[PDB]
């Protein structure tokens, strides 16, 4: 063991120095490499790199072997910038010229039958991938007679097909030959074509095979196949008329992969998703009464993943394909044959974005329930759809918290008391009032004011949260905004007094928060309104004096309230 340690130490030192002899001494001093003359290195270190069984065995299995791949690539590139690149290419050619695979296609896989053959296969796989990383993709390779190297794909397909009617060791060996296939460029289109295998399984169960062969290494296979960004994907979506499970699967694979590959650049995946988004309308056998309802929510979900992955601002307005896919979404909205649940998932994607949008909003929200949900008993499937749907609406708006959606939703709940689960409604209101920019919150306030025109239940079902959890900058600036909007509005009769109550309930809190120059004027302008001493009269007294209690908070809080 110590002797092999010394051997390997010498080997690494001398081979690093050999790289330098190519690198630190370029073609100008390649004659110093000629001092190696015969360079038994060319015939022994190649063995060592392809098989550490040639430095002994590299027993101990330490950092040096993990260093072997990158420094082997280093040495091979140094040879490439050295005149001996052809010499070493020939050397490895007698070391191997795809001779091994011609028989190692029959290593009796799918079980612990013979594995040392698989061990040597993995070693040569590693050597081939080092060559690939050292630019020796097809140079050292005796490239396929065809332009595409079937010599991996078709054998892998046949074995993975027959040898089941599994082994994770065989799985990682298949992965290794997969990277070998990846070293063969241009195969991507062939992999696309073949991977659409309708060949059903043969046993209890029967299902097409190529899909599952992909799924085995789904992520790596997607990584290979999507180097062809969309051309292969375009070819697929030509053929995706019947099968989407394959294409949807590979979509989500690279979708969550663009997520993972955000550390370097997600804009690669962003470009890919945007491009295929453009390349949507070239196949539209879906999203209408032309695909399975299953497939309809499937494309729904895929587009949802796209919308999440790209910035929502990207194609919330016409940015290219935003018209096409946006209109598809609009169709899906009009595609009202959904289950109310499915309609809720359709809703989830609305905050991604112009009046036409609001118009479809109303024409959709109408078709759920006229005014009441208690008319639909609890536990009825319709009721459960209703409650999940209002949950979806609450969260989607909470995301968007646009004044429009907000008012639409309030009008929806402004039908019956506690029929859209107003507790969660107001909780979302608390969560959005704290949320949103001051300008956004104030615009929400303008919306609630205008919809203020029982004639009081409107504001009464959506006010405390705005009055309380919006920041006292939006709140203060809206106070300044509606100073006059309240001064004027100071001044059959049921509607009038409902409006008066709304004024009570708006004005009290905005006083109680903070106090410009119309102070005493406004103080009189409110007390006179209170000052008076059917049940609307009791409501008058209570509301007016509560507002008076408010207007005591910062002024006339001491004593002697100008009697």
């Amino acid at each position: 063991e110590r002797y092999n340690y010394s051997k390997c130490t010498v080997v690494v030192r001398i081979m690093e120095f050999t790289t330098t002899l190519l690198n630190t001494s370029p073609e100008g001093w390649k004659l110093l490499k000629k001092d190696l003359c015969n360079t038994h290195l060319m015939r022994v270190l190649v063995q060592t790199l392809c098989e550490p069984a040639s430095i002994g065995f590299n027993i101990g299995d330490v950092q040096v072997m993990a260093h072997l791949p990158d420094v082997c690539v280093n040495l091979m590139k140094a040879l490439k910038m050295s005149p001996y690149k052809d010499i070493l290419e020939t050397h490895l050619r007698e070391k191997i010229t795809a001779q091994s695979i011609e028989e190692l296609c029959a290593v009796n896989l799918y079980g612990p039958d013979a594995q040392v053959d698989r061990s040597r296969l993995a070693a040569v796989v590693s050597a081939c991938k080092q060559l690939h990383r050292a630019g020796l993709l097809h140079n050292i390779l005796p490239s396929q007679s065809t332009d595409l190297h079937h010599s991996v794909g078709t054998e892998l397909l046949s074995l993975v097909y027959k040898g089941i009617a599994l082994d994770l060791s065989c799985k990682q060996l298949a992965s290794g030959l997969l990277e070998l296939a990846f070293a063969f460029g241009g195969l991507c289109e062939r992999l696309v074509s073949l991977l659409l295998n309708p060949a059903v399984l043969s046993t209890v169960i029967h299902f097409s095979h190529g899909e599952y062969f992909y799924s085995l290494f789904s992520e790596t296979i997607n990584t290979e196949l999507l180097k062809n960004l969309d051309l292969a994907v375009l070819e697929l979506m030509q053929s995706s008329v019947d099968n989407t499970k394959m294409v949807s699967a590979v979509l989500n694979g690279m979708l969550d992969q663009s997520f993972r590959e955000r550390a370097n650049q997600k804009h690669q995946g962003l470009k890919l998703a945007t491009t295929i988004l453009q390349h949507w309308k070239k196949c539209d056998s879906w999203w209408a009464k032309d695909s399975p309802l299953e497939t309809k929510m499937a494309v729904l979900a895929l587009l949802a993943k796209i919308l999440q992955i790209d910035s929502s601002v990207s194609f919330n307005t016409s940015h290219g394909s935003f018209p096409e896919v946006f209109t598809t979404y609009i169709s899906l909205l009009a595609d009202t044959k959904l289950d109310l649940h499915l309609k809720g998932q359709a809703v989830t994607l609305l905050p991604f974005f112009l009046e036409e949008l609001r118009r479809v909003l109303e024409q959709l929200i109408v078709a759920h329930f006229p005014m009441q949900s208690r008319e639909f008993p609890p536990g009825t499937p319709r009721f459960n759809n209703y409650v999940d749907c209002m949950k979806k609406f609450l969260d989607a708006l909470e995301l968007s918290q646009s004044p429009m959606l907000l008012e639409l939703m309030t009008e929806v709940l402004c039908r019956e008391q506690q029929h859209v689960m107003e507790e969660l409604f107001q909780s979302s209101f608390r969560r959005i009032a704290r949320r949103g920019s001051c300008v956004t919150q104030v615009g929400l306030l303008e919306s609630v004011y205008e919809m203020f025109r029982t004639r009081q239940s409107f504001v009464d079902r959506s006010l405390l949260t705005l009055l309380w959890h919006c920041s006292l900058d939006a709140l203060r600036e809206f106070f300044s905004t509606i100073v006059v909007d309240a001064i004027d509005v100071l001044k059959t009769f049921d509607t009038q007094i409902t409006k008066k109550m709304g004024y009570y309930k708006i004005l009290d809190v905005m006083y109680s928060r903070l106090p410009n120059e119309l102070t005493k004027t406004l103080i009189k302008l409110c007390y006179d309104a209170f000052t008076e001493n059917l049940e609307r009269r009791r409501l008058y007294h209570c509301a007016a004096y509560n507002c008076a209690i408010s207007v005591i908070c910062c002024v006339f809080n001491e004593l002697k309230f100008y009697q």
């Binding site: 024409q363 109408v366 639909f376 409107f458």
Partner: protein, 59 residues
């Protein structure tokens, strides 16, 4: 939405169903506080359906 509920109820059991009559009364009148005409058109459509359903069998 329950409009068609009681509509199919009356046109399956073939009775005047003054209870369903009051149900559709609720369905149509629910506009006093509401200025949203879409409710009004939906409700008039459903009550036209119930008008011809009254025409149908016995009411």
């Amino acid at each position: 939405n329950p409009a068609e509920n009681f509509r199919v109820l009356v046109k399956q059991k073939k009775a005047s169903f003054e209870e369903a009559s009051n149900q559709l009364i609720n369905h149509i009148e629910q506009f006093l506080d509401t200025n949203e005409t879409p409710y009004f058109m939906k409700s008039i459509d459903c009550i036209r359906a119930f008008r011809e359903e009254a025409i149908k069998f016995s009411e």
